[PDB]
Design an enzyme around this catalytic site. Structure first.
Site, PDB file in Angstrom:
ATOM      1  N   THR A   5       0.792  -1.228   0.000  1.00  0.00           N
ATOM      2  CA  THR A   5       0.000   0.000   0.000  1.00  0.00           C
ATOM      3  C   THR A   5       0.820   1.271   0.000  1.00  0.00           C
ATOM      4  O   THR A   5       1.896   1.343   0.598  1.00  0.00           O
ATOM      5  CB  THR A   5      -0.944   0.109   1.217  1.00  0.00           C
ATOM      6  OG1 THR A   5      -1.768   1.269   1.057  1.00  0.00           O
ATOM      7  CG2 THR A   5      -0.145   0.262   2.519  1.00  0.00           C
ATOM      8  N   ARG A   6       0.279   2.281  -0.666  1.00  0.00           N
ATOM      9  CA  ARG A   6       0.916   3.580  -0.747  1.00  0.00           C
ATOM     10  C   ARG A   6      -0.112   4.586  -0.246  1.00  0.00           C
ATOM     11  O   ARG A   6       0.054   5.791  -0.421  1.00  0.00           O
ATOM     12  CB  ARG A   6       1.283   3.905  -2.191  1.00  0.00           C
ATOM     13  CG  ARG A   6       0.082   4.145  -3.088  1.00  0.00           C
ATOM     14  CD  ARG A   6       0.483   4.793  -4.410  1.00  0.00           C
ATOM     15  NE  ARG A   6      -0.652   5.452  -5.051  1.00  0.00           N
ATOM     16  CZ  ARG A   6      -1.740   4.818  -5.476  1.00  0.00           C
ATOM     17  NH1 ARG A   6      -1.839   3.501  -5.337  1.00  0.00           N
ATOM     18  NH2 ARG A   6      -2.737   5.499  -6.020  1.00  0.00           N
ATOM     19  N   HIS A  59      -7.941   1.819   6.093  1.00  0.00           N
ATOM     20  CA  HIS A  59      -9.180   2.057   6.819  1.00  0.00           C
ATOM     21  C   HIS A  59      -9.697   0.720   7.324  1.00  0.00           C
ATOM     22  O   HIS A  59      -9.071  -0.317   7.088  1.00  0.00           O
ATOM     23  CB  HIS A  59     -10.201   2.737   5.904  1.00  0.00           C
ATOM     24  CG  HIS A  59      -9.722   4.039   5.341  1.00  0.00           C
ATOM     25  ND1 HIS A  59      -9.355   5.103   6.137  1.00  0.00           N
ATOM     26  CD2 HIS A  59      -9.524   4.440   4.062  1.00  0.00           C
ATOM     27  CE1 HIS A  59      -8.951   6.104   5.374  1.00  0.00           C
ATOM     28  NE2 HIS A  59      -9.044   5.729   4.111  1.00  0.00           N
ATOM     29  N   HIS A  95      -9.553  -2.274   5.015  1.00  0.00           N
ATOM     30  CA  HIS A  95      -8.224  -2.846   4.854  1.00  0.00           C
ATOM     31  C   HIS A  95      -7.865  -3.768   6.019  1.00  0.00           C
ATOM     32  O   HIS A  95      -7.236  -4.801   5.834  1.00  0.00           O
ATOM     33  CB  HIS A  95      -7.206  -1.713   4.725  1.00  0.00           C
ATOM     34  CG  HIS A  95      -7.470  -0.806   3.564  1.00  0.00           C
ATOM     35  ND1 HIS A  95      -7.511  -1.257   2.261  1.00  0.00           N
ATOM     36  CD2 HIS A  95      -7.709   0.525   3.507  1.00  0.00           C
ATOM     37  CE1 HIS A  95      -7.762  -0.243   1.451  1.00  0.00           C
ATOM     38  NE2 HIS A  95      -7.886   0.850   2.182  1.00  0.00           N
ATOM     39  N   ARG A  98      -7.476  -4.808  -6.606  1.00  0.00           N
ATOM     40  CA  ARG A  98      -8.083  -4.244  -7.808  1.00  0.00           C
ATOM     41  C   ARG A  98      -7.228  -3.048  -8.239  1.00  0.00           C
ATOM     42  O   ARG A  98      -6.821  -2.244  -7.403  1.00  0.00           O
ATOM     43  CB  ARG A  98      -9.509  -3.808  -7.472  1.00  0.00           C
ATOM     44  CG  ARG A  98     -10.415  -3.550  -8.651  1.00  0.00           C
ATOM     45  CD  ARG A  98     -11.865  -3.665  -8.201  1.00  0.00           C
ATOM     46  NE  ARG A  98     -12.803  -3.352  -9.272  1.00  0.00           N
ATOM     47  CZ  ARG A  98     -12.946  -2.142  -9.800  1.00  0.00           C
ATOM     48  NH1 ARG A  98     -12.211  -1.131  -9.352  1.00  0.00           N
ATOM     49  NH2 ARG A  98     -13.825  -1.940 -10.771  1.00  0.00           N
TER      50      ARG A  98
END
Ligand code: NA
Lengths: 512, 512, 128
Positions: free
Chosen positions: B197-198, B202, B205, B291
């Site tokens: 992740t970048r 939340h 996740h 996605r």
């Protein structure tokens, strides 16, 4: 009951020279006329003259009135007047004028304020003025200004008005003496007691004021100074927000707010009499004179500039002549078990609880971010003060890398920046390189004012320490004069960083 | 089950060149050796190479491996590899080097990183690379960088480790492949699913990740990118705070946070395979591909750079060969009546109530200062984002007095300043004169970043628009390109001031 | 206890215009009424004329019990002071026995009003 102006007639020069406006305007905007740009204190002063606020003045004092004021607290004709209102100018400009010369007085080098007809040009003895007017103490604000900001030559003269100094804030809130008197008549306000202040108002002020109104059977005029107060105080914008808020805490129809473009001298004693005169011209039958009214405070050796009651006694001694009533404000304290303020006089602290918050403690509760008792000051007002004077967690600062450091300035900066960013919270950080440029050094205090943290690689030249501002600026060096002192000049960057982080954390800037 | 490095052996160069450190350090800082300052992206890449994270690479790719990677997503020797890791240098420097030449790679022009033994020097066809590697669309972040930032000469060669690039933030949080694997061994962790992740994490996740661990009987590794993500995003500092906070919302002993110094190319398809390889070298047996993984998003015409599932499909098609399991994250939605997230697949949208907050709606609520549901993101997380991304009332800005204005610039700025100060609210205001200087123009955004309001008297030359920054900068002019458009060029100042005030109020900066 | 014994802000009261007053009783009443209405808060105000009628004097304490503010134009006969009830009833007069004492009997209505308003405010009935 509404007092006649000081000297019998409202010197509303704006109204008296109305018809000649365009005429004066042109002459002022002609290339054949000598121009003088008004300094800040002069702008405030000239507004009160054209205004009628300084009745019976009609221009800046000539040597004759000036001397009489300095030695006798009166104008040459005997009218009580304690503060010299002169147009200080420099030698150069002085050498281009003689009696009857017509000068144009501008604001910001472009707004025509008035036409001045000279009649006197003298080089006052500032030693005597400082001594006889401001009690000679070299640290007194007025004396400092007198010697370092006020030109050495005074220009006495009569004035013809073009327009009052331009303001873009609080329109219609800056009522002139004529407007105020008219407003008092609209409300059928006979007796009016005025309150002087260059500070925020708290519950005590609201109570003491309503009390004055009750005992004097007068309405209340909250007349805050918004021109120039004591150097380094709270901006007037903030104070006005506080006033507009506290005005709502008075029974409906009892108080009125109006701003006074006055430029104080912090000359307590005389200043108080001057204040009584000014409010009188503004329509007040009564004037509140506080403890150490218009007093700067204490000097270096802890000595007071004025006695706590000097002002109340001086005004009281001239009140019959001034034809106004004096409402003295006695020191007060809060009684918890009764939720009321009472004169220290009638309180036996041996058998009654008393609460008080000194200005130092308040300044501390705003620095630390602690609570402020609702009995001391209203919630809405405290919020206003909290926004303007944020606690250390929301305050900006600056860390300057001392000249004694031998570490990689670029690396230490990168290291500090990277480290500060871990804590977050809202503060914006920046490695700031000024290159000893005034255009950049002038921005340091602006960033701090914005809550920003600046990491400064190098120190600037000493002949510029005046361009910055010591507020929240810390020096990291080996010298004993540094705020963050390193034992050596070649310490590990991680060593140095930790010292800085813990310093800031101890000073409340970082909170975890 | 813990996978073996990609290629068979972890290329932890730092560990293979230990007994040669002093030696190599010397050569680096020697006077004869040619030196090259590593670009920001080159730093992230070199750190991963010396790290072992880019196994089996042992230096930058030469023309042999490069072309192989570009056309067949493999290295010359077949080994799977989709993203071209190369040392992009300018023409001048390329002409001072020849095969066998040894180069010293520095960080910030002063830190010895590693010695490079040149093997190749070529001028790749960037039109082909942009096509076969990043799909061609010119608006693609990688293709833009490729042409406008990357050098035109790739230097292939082997590397000898001196030390990994310096970091002062989050020490020990940036674990190396060797360290992570050790950290895993210490915890008896065999199966590990890595999450890439970048962006902020939340509740969704947290739930998807925990679910992944449950299904694959593996522990969780939150492996955020802290090097270079998507142009203009949330700094890694803010994100790290978010990660360290959400990492606490996991069952004890289930997840572990570690930072990845990766410089993403936002090459969706290929980058996902690249990520799987990297995470494999870090010890992860499972990798989550979501996605539009590593996808730039949409171009101008609103056309997606990659297909929603291109990344999942690609990694899924090489997983057997990669020897790692792929964990697909399906699009999810919130079910109010059940307080849980569920795949859009099994949700009868007709008979089921569902709630979702878009990335745009989140962006909006942070700008407006609106509420953000607890089900969407943990309170502590929102707090952090709110502080990093302040709402309009706490945002800074600039009002640039256009060229078409014939009105007094000195008086308009003064009127804006005094008017703004009436509102209060904590914002610091300043009239900023840049005089078309770069040293000053570069500070405009720093001020806006500090929440300040700048009043700029004049526009700056067109040749310097790139030095400023569009964000919250409005032009007050007559032209149709003005943010606050004026009817005429000489409108009364009061008229202008109001248009500006109401514009800022309608845009959130002022609240009453 | 708070509901049955409300604080002064929610308490009723009564201001009786002393016999020594020479001002227009009708005007002073109108002035007080108009003034009290500016403060608001919930209290119902009323100019109450009893005409020395017991049937009306018996209601004074009932209105006060209801939190209402009554402005009473005239005093009643002493042989009825027992019909009312001293609770929260204040006299505005020049006599030393008045609760709100005027220096003169012919003071300006605005003068008188301010004295009454500040009296009530000091006694906690009005809060700002
Ligand atoms: Na000045």
């Amino acid at each position: 009951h509404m007092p006649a102006p000081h000297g019998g007639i409202l010197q509303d020069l704006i109204a008296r020279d109305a018809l000649k406006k365009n005429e004066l305007l042109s002459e002022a905007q002609s290339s054949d006329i000598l121009v003088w740009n008004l300094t800040p204190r002069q702008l405030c002063d000239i507004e009160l003259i054209l205004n009628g606020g300084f009745s019976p003045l009609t221009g800046f004092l000539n040597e004759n009135d000036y001397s009489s004021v300095v030695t006798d607290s009166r104008l040459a004709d005997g009218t009580l007047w304690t503060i010299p209102i002169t147009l200080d100018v420099d030698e150069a400009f002085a050498n281009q004028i003689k009696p009857d010369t017509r000068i144009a007085l501008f604001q910001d080098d472009e707004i025509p304020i008035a036409i001045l007809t000279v009649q006197d040009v003298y080089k006052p003895n500032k030693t005597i003025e400082a001594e006889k007017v401001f009690r000679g103490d070299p640290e007194h604000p007025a004396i400092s200004y007198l010697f370092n900001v006020a030109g050495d030559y005074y220009v006495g003269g009569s004035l013809e008005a073009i327009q009052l100094p331009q303001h873009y804030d609080y329109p219609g809130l800056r009522k002139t003496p004529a407007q105020l008197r008219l407003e008092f008549q609209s409300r059928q306000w006979d007796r009016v007691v005025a309150f002087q202040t260059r500070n925020p108002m708290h519950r005590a002020h609201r109570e003491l004021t309503v009390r004055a109104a009750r005992e004097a059977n007068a309405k209340v005029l909250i007349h805050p100074v918004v021109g120039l107060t004591k150097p380094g105080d709270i901006d007037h914008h903030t104070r006005v927000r506080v006033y507009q808020e506290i005005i709502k805490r008075y029974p409906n129809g009892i108080a009125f707010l109006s701003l006074l473009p006055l430029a104080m001298r912090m000359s307590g004693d005389r200043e108080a009499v001057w204040h009584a005169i000014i409010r009188k011209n503004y329509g007040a039958s009564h004037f509140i004179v506080g403890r150490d009214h218009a007093g700067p405070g204490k000097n270096s050796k802890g000595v007071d500039f004025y006695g706590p009651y000097d002002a109340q006694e001086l005004v009281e001694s001239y009140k019959h002549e001034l034809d106004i009533e004096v409402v003295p404000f006695r020191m007060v304290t809060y009684l918890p078990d009764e939720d009321r303020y009472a004169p220290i006089d009638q309180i036996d602290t041996t058998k009654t609880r008393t609460l008080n918050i000194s200005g130092t403690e308040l300044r501390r509760r705003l620095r630390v971010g602690g609570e402020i008792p609702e009995w001391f000051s209203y919630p809405e007002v405290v919020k206003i003060l909290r926004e303007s004077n944020p606690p250390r967690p929301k305050q900006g600062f600056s860390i300057v890398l001392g000249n004694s450091l031998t570490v990689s300035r670029e690396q230490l900066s990168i290291a500090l920046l990277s480290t500060f960013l871990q804590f977050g919270g809202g503060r914006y950080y920046k490695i700031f390189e000024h290159n000893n440029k005034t255009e950049l050094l002038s921005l340091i205090q602006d960033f701090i004012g914005s809550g920003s943290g600046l990491i400064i690689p190098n120190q600037w030249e000493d002949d510029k320490d005046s361009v910055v501002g010591k507020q929240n600026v810390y020096l990291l060096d080996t010298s004993s004069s540094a705020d963050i002192q390193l034992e050596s000049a070649d310490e590990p960057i991680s060593h140095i960083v930790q010292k800085v982080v813990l310093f800031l954390e101890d000073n409340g800037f970082f909170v975890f």
